[PDB]
Each structure stands twice: as structure tokens, then as C-alpha cells.
């Protein structure tokens with residue numbers, strides 16, 4: 001019931017308490033844990049992943065009701081051995097995602113250090129999944145702008161809570177791409193592209209999202225809802241921004257857009273957005289001198305969007321094209 005190697009991981013059936021020791025995952029291997037239902041997995045050392053040619057995920061854990069106790073240990077993806085300024089758009093192969101977490105349970109207090117590109121993929125789930133106190137430290141990817149597409153959390157799942165986490169990276173802090181009942185609370189995001197829903201693709205539906213109590217600094221966007229212009233049979237509905245504190249934003253404080261990958265222009269109509277609110281505690285956003293405060297670019301949006309608790313300052317005014325939606329309140333124009 002102690003895992004000291006990739007091969008040991010295959011031998012944990014029957015263990016209600018697994019100890020995950022530190023070791024290196026060699027080139028051409030992956031580390032896969034399928035723990036017993038309700039097991040506790042406790043990390044007791046750091047796991048380093050030698051440079052590899054495999055596609056990710058390089059680490060996969062999948063189980064029901066898992067209690068993962070990280071004890072502040074590290075999954076080290078050796079990302080600087082791959083970073084080349086091009087991320088997953090071109091250039092060197094980047095194993096991605098680095099980690100994949102599936103099923104349900106509670107994951108606490110570990111660090112992903114220097115993912116090659118996207119750090120943690122979440123989902124699907126079979127019950128509630130909570131990630132609590134995880135650090136995605138990709139700060140080294142800021143050097144010479146080599147890290148890219150280093151998303152902290154990419155979520156395609158229902159019934160997820162991500163809280164008390166820290167992400168230092170070069171792309172979305174979180175990207176919520178599909179699922180219902182997702183809560184992102186009391187997290188700290190810096191360096192990257194802010195807190196995102198999307199990009200929304202054909203057939204994907206995000207609903208009942210709560211983005212509460214987070215801090216975003218030194219990022220390209222504060223919050224975004226992005227839908228691919230060409231997406232159809234898709235939607236975002238029921239999003240509440242509450243008590244977020246944001247500053248140091250380079251491009252847009254808020255960008256709600258159905259033009260992705262463009263920020264604006266000929267927005268699509270097949271991924272309707274509804275019921276997007278800034279309520280509860282103040283969401284205050286400070287943007288840089290060349291930035292835009294708020295832009296909404298809807299081809300198809302609906303509902304009474306209560307933005308009363310949003311304040312955005314700095315930079316210049318954006319543009320509001322809200323289609324059928326009526327946006328009330330706030331300070332940002």
C-alpha cells in the first residue's frame with residue numbers, strides 16, 4: 001500500500017490507506033492511481049516527471065470518495081525543459097494536461113510545479129469533487145515569456161468546488177469548459193489570463209457557476225465568458241460573480257464575448273449566455289492605462305443581468321452589445 005514507483009501504483013487495489021512516496025516517473029511512463037472507494041491517499045514525497053514524449057495526462061487519479069492528503073508535496077512537471085514560447089499552439093510537444101483528476105472526493109494541499117502546459121484537468125465526476133489548497137506554481141514560465149497555455153484548472157465536470165488555491169501562470173487561472181454546479185472560491189490568480197468560462201464549444205453547456213472571493217492580479221483579463229463564434233447547441237447560464245478583487249489587468253477587466261477567438265466582431269448566436277450577475281460582495285476591478293474596463297459582445301444573450309456590485313476603474317470604456325439581455329447597475333461605463 002505504499003507506492004514507490006509507477007509499477008507499484010498498479011498494486012493498490014484493497015488499500016484503504018495509500019502512501020504515495022516521492023520518486024521519478026521515468027520517460028515514457030505515466031502514473032495512474034485507481035484507489036479503492038473512500039481511500040485516503042497521502043503524499044509523502046515529491047514526484048518528478050522526467051522529460052517525456054508522451055501525451056498527457058502524465059498523472060491520472062480516478063476514484064470515488066477519495067481523500068487525497070498532499071502534505072505540501074510537489075508534482076514537478078519539468079516544464080522549462082519544454083517551454084518555447086508557443087505552448088500547445090505550435091513548437092515543441094507539451095505533455096498536457098499534466099494531471100487529470102476524475103471521480104469524486106477531496107484533494108488538498110499539494111503543488112503542481114512547472115507544468116509543460118495545462119496543469120490540472122478536472123472531470124468527469126461521479127459525485128462532489130473538491131480541490132482545496134492546491135498551488136499551481138508556473139511562475140518560472142514568465143521568464144523570457146516561454147511558458148504558455150499553462151492553465152491552472154481546466155474543468156469539464158459537474159459538482160466541482162475549487163477553493164483556497166493559488167495559480168501563478170501564463171493562461172487562464174481556471175477555464176470552465178462544460179458542466180453544472182461549479183464553485184471557484186477564495187483563490188489567488190496571478191500572471192495569467194484571469195478567471196474564464198470557456199471557450200465554449202459546440203455541444204457544451206456551463207451552468208450554475210459561482211465565482212466568489214477570488215483575487216486576480218497582473219493578468220491579461222479579469223473575468224471572461226468566451227464562446228467560440230462557430231459554436232452551436234451550447235450555452236452558459238447562471239453565473240454569479242461575488243466579492244472578487246482584481247487589479248493589474250492588461251486587456252479587459254470583464255470580457256463577455258461570443259466572438260472567440262476574437263475579442264469582438266460578428267459574435268455567434270449558437271452559444272446563448274443567460275443570467276450573468278455581479279452581486280453579493282463588491283467585485284472591484286482596476287485595469288491598466290491601455291486596457292478596456294468592460295466589453296460585452298453578444299450575438300445571443302438573455303435575462304436581467306444584475307451587475308450592481310461591479311465596479312471597474314482605469315483604462316478606457318469598452319462597448320456593450322447585450323442582445324436581449326438587460327444589464328443593470330454597476331460602475332464601469
Ligand SMILES: *[C@@H]1O[C@H](CO)[C@@H](O)[C@H](O)[C@H]1NC(C)=O
Pocket residue numbers: 089090091
Ligand atoms: C503552426 O505552425 C505552422 C507552421 O509553423 C502554421 O501553418 C500553423 O498555422 C501554426 N498553428 C498555430 C496554432 O500556430
Ligand SMILES: *[C@@H]1O[C@H](CO)[C@@H](O)[C@H](O)[C@H]1NC(C)=O
Pocket residue numbers: 126127128158159180181
Ligand atoms: C452531480 O451533477 C448532476 C448534474 O448536475 C446532478 O444530477 C447530481 O445530483 C450531482 N451530484 C452531486 C453529488 O452533487
Ligand SMILES: O=C(O)[C@@H](O)[C@@H]1O[C@@H](O)[C@H](O)[C@H]1O
Pocket residue numbers: 088118149150151154171172175198199226
Ligand atoms: O479557451 C480556449 O479555447 C483556450 O484558452 C484553450 O484553453 C486551454 O486548453 C489552452 O490554454 C487553450 O488551448
Ligand SMILES: O=C(O)[C@H]1O[C@@H](O)[C@H](O)[C@@H](O)[C@H]1O
Pocket residue numbers: 087089149171172193
Ligand atoms: O486566453 C486565451 O483564450 C488565449 O490566450 C492566447 O494567449 C493563447 O495563445 C491561446 O491559446 C488562448 O489560451
Ligand SMILES: [Cl-]
Pocket residue numbers: 027028029051052053054
Ligand atoms: Cl519518452
